[PDB]
Amino acid sequence: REMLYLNRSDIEQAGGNHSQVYVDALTEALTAHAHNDFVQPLKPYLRQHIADRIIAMPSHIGGEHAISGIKWIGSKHDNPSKRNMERASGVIILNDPETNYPIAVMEASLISSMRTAAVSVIAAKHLAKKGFKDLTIIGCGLIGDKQLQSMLEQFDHIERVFVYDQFSEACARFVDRWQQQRPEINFIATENAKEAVSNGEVVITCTVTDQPYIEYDWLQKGAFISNISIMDVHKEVFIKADKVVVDDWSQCNLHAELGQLVTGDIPGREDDDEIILLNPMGMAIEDISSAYFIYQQAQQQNIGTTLNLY
Amino acid sequence: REMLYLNRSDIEQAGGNHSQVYVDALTEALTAHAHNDFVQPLKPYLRQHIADRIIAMPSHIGGEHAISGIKWIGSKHDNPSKRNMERASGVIILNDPETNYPIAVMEASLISSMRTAAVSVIAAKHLAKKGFKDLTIIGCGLIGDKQLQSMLEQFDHIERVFVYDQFSEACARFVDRWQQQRPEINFIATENAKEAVSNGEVVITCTVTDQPYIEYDWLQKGAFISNISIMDVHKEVFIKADKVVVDDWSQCNLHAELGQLVTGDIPGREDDDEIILLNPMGMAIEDISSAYFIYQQAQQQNIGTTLNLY
Numbered sequence A, B: 001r002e003m004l005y006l007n008r009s010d011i012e013q014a015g016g017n018h019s020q021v022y023v024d025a026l027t028e029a030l031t032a033h034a035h036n037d038f039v040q041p042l043k044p045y046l047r048q049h050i051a052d053r054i055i056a057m058p059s060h061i062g063g064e065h066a067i068s069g070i071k072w073i074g075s076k077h078d079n080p081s082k083r084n085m086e087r088a089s090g091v092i093i094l095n096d097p098e099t100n101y102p103i104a105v106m107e108a109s110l111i112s113s114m115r116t117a118a119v120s121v122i123a124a125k126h127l128a129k130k131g132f133k134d135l136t137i138i139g140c141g142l143i144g145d146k147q148l149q150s151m152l153e154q155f156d157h158i159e160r161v162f163v164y165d166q167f168s169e170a171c172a173r174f175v176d177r178w179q180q181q182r183p184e185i186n187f188i189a190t191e192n193a194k195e196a197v198s199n200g201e202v203v204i205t206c207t208v209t210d211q212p213y214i215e216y217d218w219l220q221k222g223a224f225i226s227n228i229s230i231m232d233v234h235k236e237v238f239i240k241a242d243k244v245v246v247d248d249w250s251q252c253n254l255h256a257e258l259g260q261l262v263t264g265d266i267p268g269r270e271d272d273d274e275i276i277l278l279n280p281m282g283m284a285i286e287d288i289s290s291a292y293f294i295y296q297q298a299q300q301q302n303i304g305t306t307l308n309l310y
């Protein structure tokens, strides 16, 4: 009985640091979600602050290439502040549905951040205006960085990126390094959240806030907002938005669930005036499908450390 | 960021194949449970049969040597039958409560079976008659084997062991091999469950049944029964038993919870006529405390494979 171990470096080497593999994996997974060919229990929170927890996210995906597993992801808001460590960390375990035996142990933080960015990309394909040019990011942390990276990889027509962080220094670092990575694009450090949001055709919230600040009349007409960090958006926006989209309804306790957009069962953006809001809680099937996708490529390229179970 | 990997062989080498380390670990853990110095969410079942599932069991134990983690344990009743693999398998992850980062990845099946046997031993210390000589095991699988091993290690006064399995061949193998391990003890293969149970001062159920068969008037007066497999015991026994003990009440949806027996807050057996029933659902704090105990000894004896997280 063997298990393939894949650290973050191995995952990158297997192609886990580019958005396309996650877009591909989620596309098939979200299709499976719409066809209800999955099992996804409620995720229990282990708290001993909102960003101080470890969440167990188990799921099963059906099919001929059926896969099971869990994401065991921890978090401490203090980690970057007081320890110079990433806030989130954890492992992903994959399981053979035939025996339920574990077949893979994989680092989770990179996969988690990249699938989350892929959620925004996929939603933008259906909900954002065609050829949108202004992107807005709030929160210059790990998640926000991968959000920006993925959107740039997937949308070549992006010309300006408006960035804001409550911590001015965090925003300054973020803008400066990305300005070097993409010189032809103007990265604009705003002085408040309102200036950044009101200048964005696509707005992504990547903070750790516990109280909303996003007001409805900030949003441009035709704007699409991927509410990744959930708590950033005022209730009025949920009411005044032309279309509200979630990833999984029962999990969020309505225009559509994200899976129905990819299957064409429910249309996405229908005009360039619609203000569309995405509220994705994050699903375990996203982590498991992404992990199983990467794990297979690693096996192909002989990447990873083989462990014995017994 | 490093993680110590410990397979089943490493766990044995670190002393994970003797009951005493589990009795020690649970004793402190059950003490912590009684003092409510723990966090233990409800465990979600992942089903895609009763023994066909994967269970996420996360918990946190407080203190100066506080520890967090999860047991991700899968099961397939078909595994021994059609594949010659153990029914249960899985991994245990340990986490540093300060950062919630993972610090250990450990095989779970051995630890799981041994802590479960330690639950029976500890309960027997309080609920079984002093110097009991007749032990009864129903179910000759992996769990039942470790149940027998641990009881023999902890109770030298055991003279006879009555064994039964619905599958006659399973019972025959079990009895024969254990008769060679302990020749001075009479291992008696019974022809029905009733004969085995009615001859036991301590009765342990280790099957995978879904319907009760244990009747009240089978039980001797003074008997103690550790209902490990849960479903073996008829409802009448719960009513007619002099004392009913569980491991965790809220988890089982009453004389005492097991933790209160170890703290002396509630007495155990008070006379040798009391028929006492233990109904242990199994707690994550049992797996996590046992794992953290073993993990520490492995670090001392330089046992295990060091992995990099990034």
Ligand SMILES: NC(=O)C1=CN([C@@H]2O[C@H](COP(=O)(O)OP(=O)(O)OC[C@H]3O[C@@H](n4cnc5c(N)ncnc54)[C@H](O)[C@@H]3O)[C@@H](O)[C@H]2O)C=CC1
Binding pocket: A077, A080, A087, A088, A112, A113, A116, A138, A139, A140, A141, A142, A143, A144, A164, A165, A166, A167, A170, A193, A206, A207, A208, A209, A227, A228, A229, A280, A281, A282, A283
């Ligand atoms: N929906 C999903 O599936 C996922 C959601 N999330 C969420 O994304 C966030 C994680 O971000 P990370 O980069 O990993 O952690 P992080 O701590 O490294 O990033 C936080 C950054 O946002 C900034 N920020 C905080 N609060 C703010 C505010 N009120 N206003 C404006 N700007 C602000 C902070 O200064 C910090 O720079 C968490 O809230 C997490 O819950 C995380 C992963 C996936």
Ligand SMILES: NC(=O)C1=CN([C@@H]2O[C@H](COP(=O)(O)OP(=O)(O)OC[C@H]3O[C@@H](n4cnc5c(N)ncnc54)[C@H](O)[C@@H]3O)[C@@H](O)[C@H]2O)C=CC1
Binding pocket: B077, B080, B087, B088, B112, B113, B116, B138, B139, B140, B141, B142, B143, B144, B164, B165, B166, B167, B170, B193, B206, B207, B208, B209, B227, B228, B229, B280, B281, B282, B283
């Ligand atoms: N309370 C706790 O914390 C724990 C409870 N359990 C339970 O212990 C059982 C696992 O046993 P394993 O040895 O690991 O699996 P196993 O499949 O290897 O053992 C099953 C054995 O019991 C026999 N058996 C089944 N049904 C029966 C019946 N109606 N009557 C009489 N005899 C019978 C089977 O023939 C088989 O030999 C499961 O029911 C599991 O849920 C397992 C682990 C810890």
Ligand SMILES: N[C@@H](CN[C@@H](CCC(=O)O)C(=O)O)C(=O)O
Binding pocket: A055, A057, A073, A074, A075, A088, A112, A228, A229, A230, A280, A281, A282, A283
């Ligand atoms: N929206 C959820 C976050 N759930 C995320 C957790 C990922 C992480 O903590 O880095 C996930 O889906 O994995 C929340 O606010 O608690």
Ligand SMILES: N[C@@H](CN[C@@H](CCC(=O)O)C(=O)O)C(=O)O
Binding pocket: B055, B057, B073, B074, B075, B088, B112, B228, B229, B230, B280, B281, B282, B283
């Ligand atoms: N009593 C529970 C069993 N819970 C066990 C699972 C362990 C295993 O499946 O080997 C555990 O506590 O780990 C049930 O009947 O579902």
Ligand SMILES: [Cl-]
Binding pocket: A046, A047, A048, A052, A053, A054, B100
């Ligand atoms: Cl916490």
Ligand SMILES: [Cl-]
Binding pocket: A100, B046, B047, B048, B052, B053, B054
């Ligand atoms: Cl299953």
